[PDB]
Design an enzyme around this catalytic site. Structure first.
Site, PDB file in Angstrom:
ATOM      1  CB  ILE A  28      38.204 147.141 -22.341  1.00 20.25           C
ATOM      2  CG1 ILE A  28      39.500 147.354 -23.126  1.00 20.25           C
ATOM      3  CG2 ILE A  28      37.231 146.288 -23.149  1.00 20.25           C
ATOM      4  CD1 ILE A  28      40.206 146.070 -23.497  1.00 20.25           C
ATOM      5  NE  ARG A  44      40.277 157.116 -36.169  1.00 17.86           N
ATOM      6  CZ  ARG A  44      40.255 157.756 -35.000  1.00 17.86           C
ATOM      7  NH1 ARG A  44      41.285 158.501 -34.622  1.00 17.86           N
ATOM      8  NH2 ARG A  44      39.196 157.663 -34.209  1.00 17.86           N
ATOM      9  CG  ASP A  59      37.061 156.758 -31.922  1.00 20.09           C
ATOM     10  OD1 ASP A  59      38.034 157.530 -31.834  1.00 20.09           O
ATOM     11  OD2 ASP A  59      36.138 156.720 -31.083  1.00 20.09           O
ATOM     12  CD  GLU A 115      42.184 157.349 -30.657  1.00 20.48           C
ATOM     13  OE1 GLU A 115      41.200 156.674 -30.287  1.00 20.48           O
ATOM     14  OE2 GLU A 115      42.337 158.554 -30.371  1.00 20.48           O
ATOM     15  CG  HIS A 147      40.977 164.604 -33.987  1.00 22.69           C
ATOM     16  ND1 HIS A 147      41.879 163.711 -34.531  1.00 22.69           N
ATOM     17  CD2 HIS A 147      40.008 163.854 -33.412  1.00 22.69           C
ATOM     18  CE1 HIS A 147      41.471 162.479 -34.292  1.00 22.69           C
ATOM     19  NE2 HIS A 147      40.338 162.536 -33.613  1.00 22.69           N
ATOM     20  CG  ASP A 148      41.914 163.297 -30.000  1.00 25.88           C
ATOM     21  OD1 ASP A 148      40.888 163.977 -29.793  1.00 25.88           O
ATOM     22  OD2 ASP A 148      41.876 162.148 -30.487  1.00 25.88           O
ATOM     23  NE  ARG A 204      38.974 168.305 -32.050  1.00 24.18           N
ATOM     24  CZ  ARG A 204      38.207 167.407 -31.441  1.00 24.18           C
ATOM     25  NH1 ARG A 204      36.887 167.467 -31.569  1.00 24.18           N
ATOM     26  NH2 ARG A 204      38.755 166.450 -30.705  1.00 24.18           N
TER      27      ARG A 204
HETATM   28 CA   LIG Z   1      34.237 150.096 -24.334  1.00 25.15          CA
END
Ligand SMILES: [Ca+2]
Ligand SMILES: OC[C@H]1O[C@H](O[C@H]2[C@H](O)[C@@H](O)[C@@H](O[C@H]3[C@H](O)[C@@H](O)[C@@H](O)O[C@@H]3CO)O[C@@H]2CO)[C@H](O)[C@@H](O)[C@@H]1O
Ligand SMILES: OC[C@H]1O[C@H](O[C@H]2[C@H](O)[C@@H](O)[C@@H](O[C@H]3[C@H](O)[C@@H](O)[C@H](O)O[C@@H]3CO)O[C@@H]2CO)[C@H](O)[C@@H](O)[C@@H]1O
Ligand SMILES: OC[C@H]1O[C@H](O[C@H]2[C@H](O)[C@@H](O)[C@@H](O)O[C@@H]2CO)[C@H](O)[C@@H](O)[C@@H]1O
Ligand SMILES: [Ca+2]
Length: 686
Positions: free
Chosen positions: A190, A227, A229, A257, A327-328, A375
């Protein structure tokens, strides 16, 4: 309007989301395509722009590709303006085609379109009953290096054209300078940068206010969802204050996510989904489905445990967004694998709890390894594939069968390769049978359901070798054989006479905000809505119909309440719990306590005189607090969402299990800022 209306921005459980990578979908306007080494019209170089734009999406909405598939909501790449620099990572060039490298959150990415094109997208979408969700990544700006101010755009952040600051010489402290994360701990991921992306510092008032004003712009443009991220990489306290900004202005369904790997179950992930104000992408569901239907590293018993477990860990499991890839991740369909596996995974997902999300191209059997091979440009817009038809048959069921949208889940038959579950909600039932074994049929006997006596045709029409179900008395199904790779859907629908709440949103807001209560059997005339023991009726109930109720949150004390309604006749409904009433507008404040020594396993927590701090209840204390990055033990810190402009009393406590040790002396006191952020630094009182 009904709960299934396109105007319902608070509920997506009756919808089916189609995730579109704008650039790799359809080039509807070649005039805005980038040029030079940043463009590749053949889309062979999957790291450069290919040309896909919003006009292209509009065309595919108007020629019936998406509507004919049963899609009712689309999720597109972040719309904001990204960097224009072509980054070179060891020979290979890279562009912001994906849209995750923002430079200005108040402008659009020219390659996608102008503000006008965006408005046209919203108009065209809504006209076809399709909701629009945008990706939003406020965790960072772009790839930067304090050493190479020449690299990319130094992660520079702009406020509608006006420069705020760059990563190099960040005297204003807009970004974090703690190094890069190794994903070792939550705190580490974080407060330390994600890869080489300039990590924004949300403790900075300029950043805090900027991001909250930026999102309001898009809300005014008419988006239906968001959404978030990398929510796993931002302070949870700040995100809660951010969700309050959204919910106290223009509420929209939001999900973030939080990446989870195979067999990973995080208690923090659950806590975030239950009290942050937003739901999450169901990675626990996605990874397990892959194990059972794709890689075969687990059986139906593991799938059952996931379904039963998640329904217990998530307060609102019906808000978690499900999927089988994105996509990941590697495309679900392996170029050499049997197609029936992708088809069954789709059928399973579309009829399971939560909000189904389909990655573009899935219906076309696209294959591909990890980024960027996953992708590629969608190869065709054919409606003749089996997967396209499966979605076409099952998607609409979330709109017409509330058992699938709001229903509970129950295992009725199971073994290594077979799973038969039942969705139930009021007088609505749906039974789904799946046989993952592609070479062996299964003899199903002893199946009991809630279906009324009679015969049921497979909704898939036998597309996936399903069969007819003959049900007798007591719901006992007659013996039958489930073909190899077989998949069948049976159902029963009827009017519900008793008020039944199936969904509520938003789940967090201050008094005065209007919430939406969806379900069945509410009656056509106004009844009463209860927030705990407080009754609400009359004018404050803005609208009332059989499937949807709109009521303003009463001015009650901040806290957690149970929602319950009653029709005009006075018949009460079921209880929908975990609704949080805020004490008012929110601000993110950082708390820091010094010299708070502890023993291993023992952590420091925060409690106070407001509901946002748990109202002095140790069981509802905020924490555990951090002590590694920004501040190191014996100093502890934590970012908390608190009522703006309120004078709050608080104390810290050390907890080991449920054993509590209070701080000595009198309560610490302070008045939260009416806007922006602040940092409270105090010493632990013996
Ligand atoms: Ca951060
Ligand atoms: O960082 C998260 C971590 O915080 C807390 O751990 C601290 C301990 O409470 C504190 O005593 C101290 O740990 C020492 C041990 O007590 C001692 O036996 C020996 O091992 O030296 C240690 C030095 O660190 O500091 C840690 C902080 O790292 C909390 O108890 C943990 O549960 C939590 O995971
Ligand atoms: O429950 C609401 C009150 O919660 C808080 O009170 C805490 C004190 O802050 C804490 O010091 C501790 O007080 C105990 C005291 O130290 C001890 O000598 C005495 O014998 O028992 C006290 C507890 O009964 O624990 C209480 C919680 O019980 C908060 O400070 C206060 O303002 C709230 O009203
Ligand atoms: O008959 C009620 C019974 O049905 C299901 O049990 C199945 C079981 O899952 C199969 O593996 C096999 O053994 O047939 C059983 C029925 O004869 C339910 O799983 C079970 O809970 C329920 O009691
Ligand atoms: Ca274009």
């Amino acid at each position: 309007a009904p709960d299934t209306s396109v105007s319902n921005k608070q509920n997506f459980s009756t919808d089916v989301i189609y995730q579109i990578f704008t650039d790799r979908f359809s080039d509807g306007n070649p005039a805005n395509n980038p040029t030079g080494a940043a463009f590749d019209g053949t889309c062979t170089n999957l790291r450069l722009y290919c040309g896909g734009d919003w006009q292209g999406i509009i065309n595919k909405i108007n020629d019936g590709y998406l509507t004919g598939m049963g899609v009712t909501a689309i999720w597109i790449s972040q719309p904001v303006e990204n960097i224009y620099s072509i980054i070179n990572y060891s020979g290979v060039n890279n562009t912001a085609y994906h849209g995750y490298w923002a430079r200005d959150f108040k402008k659009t990415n020219p390659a996608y379109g102008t503000i006008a094109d965006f408005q046209n997208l919203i108009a065209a979408a809504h006209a076809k009953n399709i909701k629009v969700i945008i990706d939003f990544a406020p965790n960072h700006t772009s790839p930067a290096s304090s050493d190479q101010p020449s690299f990319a755009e130094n992660g520079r952040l702009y406020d509608n054209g006006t420069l705020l600051g760059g990563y190099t010489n960040d005297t204003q402290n807009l970004f974090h300078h703690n190094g890069g994360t190794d994903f070792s701990t939550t705190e580490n991921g974080i407060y330390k940068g994600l890869y080489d992306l300039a990590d924004l510092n949300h403790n900075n008032s300029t950043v805090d206010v900027y991001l909250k004003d930026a999102i309001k712009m898009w809300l005014d443009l008419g988006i239906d969802g968001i959404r978030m991220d990398a929510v796993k990489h931002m302070p949870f306290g700040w995100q809660k204050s951010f969700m309050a900004a959204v919910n106290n202005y223009k509420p929209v369904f939001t999900f973030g996510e939080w990446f989870l790997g195979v067999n990973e179950v995080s208690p923090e992930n659950h806590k975030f989904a239950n009290e942050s104000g937003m739901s999450l992408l169901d990675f626990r569901f996605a990874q397990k489905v892959r194990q059972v239907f794709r890689d075969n590293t687990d059986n139906m018993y593991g799938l059952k445990a996931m379904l039963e477990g998640s329904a217990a860990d998530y307060a609102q499991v019906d808000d978690q967004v499900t999927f089988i890839d994105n996509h990941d991740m590697e495309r679900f369909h392996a170029s050499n694998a049997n197609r029936r596996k992708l088809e069954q995974a789709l059928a399973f997902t579309l009829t399971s709890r939560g909000v189904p999300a389909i990655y573009y191209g899935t219906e076309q059997y696209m294959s591909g390894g990890t980024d960027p091979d996953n992708r590629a440009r969608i190869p065709s817009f054919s409606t003749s594939t089996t997967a396209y038809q499966v979605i076409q048959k099952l998607a609409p069921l979330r709109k017409c069968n509330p058992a699938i949208a709001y229903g509970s889940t129950q295992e009725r038959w199971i073994n290594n390769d077979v799973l038969i579950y039942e969705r139930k909600f009021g007088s609505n039932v749906a039974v789904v049978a799946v046989n993952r074994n592609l070479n062996a049929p299964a003899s199903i006997s002893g199946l009991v359901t809630s279906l009324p006596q009679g015969s049921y045709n497979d909704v898939l029409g036998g597309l996936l070798n399903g069969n007819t179900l003959s049900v007798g008395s007591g719901g006992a199904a007659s013996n039958f054989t489930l073909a190899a790779g077989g998949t069948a859907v049976w159902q029963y629908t009827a009017a519900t006479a008793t008020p039944t709440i199936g969904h509520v949103g938003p789940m967090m807001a201050k008094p005065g905000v209007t919430i939406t209560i969806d379900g069945r059997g509410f009656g056509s005339s106004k009844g009463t809505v209860y927030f705990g023991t407080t009754a609400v009726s009359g004018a404050d109930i803005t609208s009332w119909e059989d499937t949807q109720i709109k009521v303003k949150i009463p001015a009650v004390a901040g806290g957690n309440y149970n929602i319950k309604v009653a029709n005009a006749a006075g018949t009460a409904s079921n209880v929908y719990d975990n609704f949080e009433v805020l004490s008012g507008d929110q601000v993110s404040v950082r708390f820091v306590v010094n010299n708070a020594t502890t023993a291993l396993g023992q952590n420091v927590y925060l409690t106070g005189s407001v509901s946002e701090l748990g109202n002095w209840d140790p069981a509802k204390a905020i924490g555990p607090m951090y002590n590694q990055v920004v501040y190191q033990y014996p100093n502890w810190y934590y970012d908390v969402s608190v009522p703006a402009g309120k004078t709050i009393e608080f104390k810290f406590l050390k907890k080991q299990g449920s054993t509590v040790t209070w701080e000595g002396g009198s309560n610490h006191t302070f008045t939260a800022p009416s806007s922006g952020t602040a940092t409270i630094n105090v010493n632990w009182q013996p």
